[PDB]
């Protein structure tokens, strides 16, 4: 069980850790988050009480170093940093725990929600989508644009999701225009799975990371990426059976976790209607179709 | 985006453009089978590809053999149309290639866009205009070459005959759309109006009769009257 200490909390802020969240008051003696489960990526996220615009946060894995949060009064945000001195860090964490100034990652033992949302998400893949190679952790916020969004403007601060475009030469083989446009199996299996992702795990990892950025930061380009990756599979007549079974589970936990109040901005009516009712895979997502029909029948 | 009443003069500027109409590509007669079920029999069709500035018509005849053993023919017809338009653009010298293609039906946008990915500088556009190009098979000489075809064939026409010697493109296109609108609303009546006076003939190298300027005005008036009558009938107004 790992710890992300905080130097202090000088400004009033809602703090998120994965799917949990806590209100901290201006100058409240809050010194961080303990009992963080080893074995998963995590995201620690922020919304200032005074500016409910700019949700922002840090993807990290405690196996990769000792990480703390410290408020920067110049840049006006909670910043993640690495402590390279192992003994200084253990000594800081031990004091804050003794003084019980830390909230406990509040995991219910029965509850596999975070595992289910992050099954294929790897910290090494996050660091290729979010490029800042001098840090072991990755910053994301509401306003960051995707490489694809920039083509249709600062590359340093962009989300480098794999570009998917159904009306592109990459997607359509010369002489198989109608076939490749109505059945995207070629684009999914040869171009994307064998060509770029190499395996279904890396594909699912990017899909899951795009969803979580959409949900935790309301990042619009992430939302577009998540829908595109769903639609490419649902619009393919030929998908390995294990990928369909696993997609059903992934989407089930995503729909189960989505705040009921955000379904109107985070869910694309056209894509979901097409995927559940018209697509080749319309009969292949039983768990996903049941939770969508019971929780968001309006959208459908 | 879409071509409408507001951006109408753009049709007659010096940027090469083509209208594509796919409404006569897939044509059937519906009949009873011996067992009393219904079946279709396909007949020859055509893609109607028109430069509205020059009057040049690229009539690609669609022979019934292209449908043999194919499923979902009304969907395939949109893709076949896009394949043939794409092949036509690639067969034209660069300086003759269109800068825009306007499709008369929105269902042609995705098929044409996907066939034309090699031509990112050619804009594919829909239109708000309700163009009567479906009535092209009411022009006797176009109907005759489609129905006699025994194989795939491209036939070049000028749908304005020699009118551009006397009138602007704008005026030629308005005359064309009025003739086709009449032919579409009441074919028999429209055709009586065009051929009633036997002294006015159709030249071997033309589609329409050799009307003087004065006779075109009378003809245009008869077509307007035909259209408004049928409108009162359709709508009991």
Swiss-Prot record, chain A:
Residues 244-265 are annotated as: Leucine-zipper. Gene3D superfamilies: 2.60.34.20, Aar2, C-terminal domain-like. Phosphorylated on serine and tyrosine residues. The modification Phosphoserine is found at residue 236. The keyword Cell membrane does not apply. GO terms for cellular component: cytoplasm; U5 snRNP. It is found in: Cytoplasm; Nucleus. InterPro entries: AAR2, AAR2_C, AAR2_C_sf, Aar2_N, AAR2_N_sf. The modification Phosphothreonine is found at residue 257. Changing residue 236 to D/E: Disrupts interaction with PRP8. The keyword Phosphoprotein applies. GO terms for biological process: spliceosomal snRNP assembly; spliceosomal tri-snRNP complex assembly. Changing residue 236 to A: No effect on interaction with PRP8. Keywords: Cytoplasm, mRNA processing, mRNA splicing, Nucleus, Phosphoprotein. Belongs to the AAR2 family. Present with 7330 molecules/cell in log phase SD medium. Component of the U5 snRNP complex that is required for spliceosome assembly and for pre-mRNA splicing. Involved in splicing pre-mRNA of the A1 cistron and other genes that are important for cell growth. Heterodimer. Interacts with PRP8 (via RNase H homology domain and MPN domain), competing with BRR2 for the same binding site. Component of a U5 snRNP complex that contains at least the U5 snRNA, PRP8, SNU114, AAR2, SMB1, SMD1, SMD2, SMD3, SME1, SMX2 and SMX3, but is not a component of the U4/U6-U5 tri-snRNP complex. This is A1 cistron-splicing factor AAR2. The lineage of its organism: Eukaryota, Fungi, Dikarya, Ascomycota, Saccharomycotina. The gene is AAR2.
UniProtKB/Swiss-Prot annotation, chain B:
Residues 7-237 are annotated as: RNase H homology domain. It comes from the Eukaryota. It is found in: Nucleus. Changing residue 105 to K: Severely impaired growth. Reduced growth at 30 degrees Celsius. Strongly reduced growth at 16 degrees Celsius. Present with 468 molecules/cell in log phase SD medium. Component of the U4/U6-U5 tri-snRNP complex composed of the U4, U6 and U5 snRNAs and at least PRP3, PRP4, PRP6, PRP8, PRP18, PRP31, PRP38, SNU13, SNU23, SNU66, SNU114, SPP381, SMB1, SMD1, SMD2, SMD3, SMX2, SMX3, LSM2, LSM3, LSM4, LSM5, LSM6, LSM7, LSM8, BRR2 and DIB1. The MPN (JAB/Mov34) domain has structural similarity with deubiquitinating enzymes, but lacks the residues that would bind the catalytic metal ion. Contains a region with structural similarity to reverse transcriptase, presenting the classical thumb, fingers and palm architecture, but lacks enzyme activity, since the essential metal-binding residues are not conserved. Functions as a scaffold that mediates the ordered assembly of spliceosomal proteins and snRNAs. Required for association of BRR2 with the spliceosomal U5 snRNP, and the subsequent assembly of the U4/U6-U5 tri-snRNP complex. Functions as a scaffold that positions spliceosomal U2, U5 and U6 snRNAs at splice sites on pre-mRNA substrates, so that splicing can occur. Interacts with both the 5' and the 3' splice site, as well as the branch region. Has a role in branch site-3' splice site selection. Associates with the branch site-3' splice 3'-exon region. Also has a role in cell cycle. This is Pre-mRNA-splicing factor 8. It comes from Saccharomyces cerevisiae (strain ATCC 204508 / S288c) (Baker's yeast). The lineage of its organism: Eukaryota, Fungi, Dikarya, Ascomycota, Saccharomycotina. The chain holds residues 1836 to 2069 of 2413 of the full protein.
């Amino acid at each position: 069980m790992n710890t992300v200490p905080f130097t202090s909390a000088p400004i009033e802020v809602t703090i998120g850790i994965d799917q949990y969240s806590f209100n901290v008051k201006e100058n409240q003696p809050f010194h961080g988050i303990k009992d963080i489960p080893i074995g998963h990526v995590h995201v620690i996220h922020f919304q200032h009480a005074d500016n409910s615009s700019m949700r922002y946060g840090y993807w990290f894995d405690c196996r990769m170093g000792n990480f703390y949060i410290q408020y920067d009064p110049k840049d006006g945000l909670y910043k993640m940093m690495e402590e390279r001195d192992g003994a200084k860090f253990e000594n800081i964490v031990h004091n804050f725990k003794e003084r019980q100034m830390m909230v406990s990652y509040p995991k219910i033992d029965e509850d596999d929600t975070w595992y289910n949302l992050t099954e294929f998400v790897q910290m090494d893949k996050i660091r290729k989508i979010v490029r800042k190679d001098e840090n072991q952790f990755s910053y994301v916020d509401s306003s960051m644009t995707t490489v694809q969004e920039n083509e249709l403007s600062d590359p340093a601060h962009s989300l480098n999701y794999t570009v998917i475009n159904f009306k592109s030469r990459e997607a359509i083989r010369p002489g198989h225009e109608m076939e490749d446009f109505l059945d995207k199996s070629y684009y999914l299996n040869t171009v994307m799975l064998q060509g770029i992702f190499k395996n279904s795990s890396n594909y699912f990892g990017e899909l899951q990371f795009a969803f979580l950025n959409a949900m935790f930061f309301g990042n619009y380009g992430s939302s577009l990426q998540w829908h595109a990756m769903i639609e490419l599979i649902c619009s393919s007549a030929t998908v390995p059976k294990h990928m369909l079974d696993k997609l059903d589970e992934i989407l089930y936990y995503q729909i189960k976790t989505l705040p009921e109040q955000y379904s109107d901005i985070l869910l694309n009516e056209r894509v979901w209607n097409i995927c559940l009712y018209s697509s080749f895979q319309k009969n292949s997502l039983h768990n996903t179709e049941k939770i969508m029909e019971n929780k968001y029948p309006e959208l459908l | 985006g879409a071509m409408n009443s507001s951006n109408y003069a753009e049709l007659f500027n010096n940027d090469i453009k083509l209208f594509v109409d796919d409404t006569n590509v897939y044509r059937v007669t519906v009949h009873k089978t011996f067992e009393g079920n219904v079946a279709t029999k396909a007949i020859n069709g055509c893609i109607f590809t028109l430069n509205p500035k020059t009057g040049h018509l690229f009539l690609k005849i669609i022979h019934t053999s292209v449908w043999a053993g194919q499923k979902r023919l009304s969907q395939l017809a949109k893709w076949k149309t896009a394949e043939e338009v794409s092949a036509l653009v690639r067969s034209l010298p660069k300086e003759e290639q269109p800068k825009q293609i306007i499709v008369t039906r929105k269902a042609m946008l995705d098929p044409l866009e996907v066939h034309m990915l090699d031509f990112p500088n050619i804009a594919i556009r829909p239109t708000e205009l309700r163009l009567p190009f479906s009535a092209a098979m009411s022009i006797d000489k176009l109907s005759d070459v489609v129905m006699k075809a025994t194989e795939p064939q491209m036939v070049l026409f000028n749908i304005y005959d020699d009118w551009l010697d006397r009138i602007s493109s704008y005026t030629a296109f308005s005359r064309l759309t009025l003739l086709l609108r009449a032919l579409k609303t009441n074919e028999e009546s429209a055709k009586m109006i065009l051929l009633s006076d036997p002294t006015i003939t159709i030249k071997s190298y033309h589609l329409w009769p050799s009307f003087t300027d004065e006779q075109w005005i009378t003809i245009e008036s008869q077509m307007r009257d035909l259209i408004l009558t049928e409108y009162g009938r359709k709508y009991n107004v």
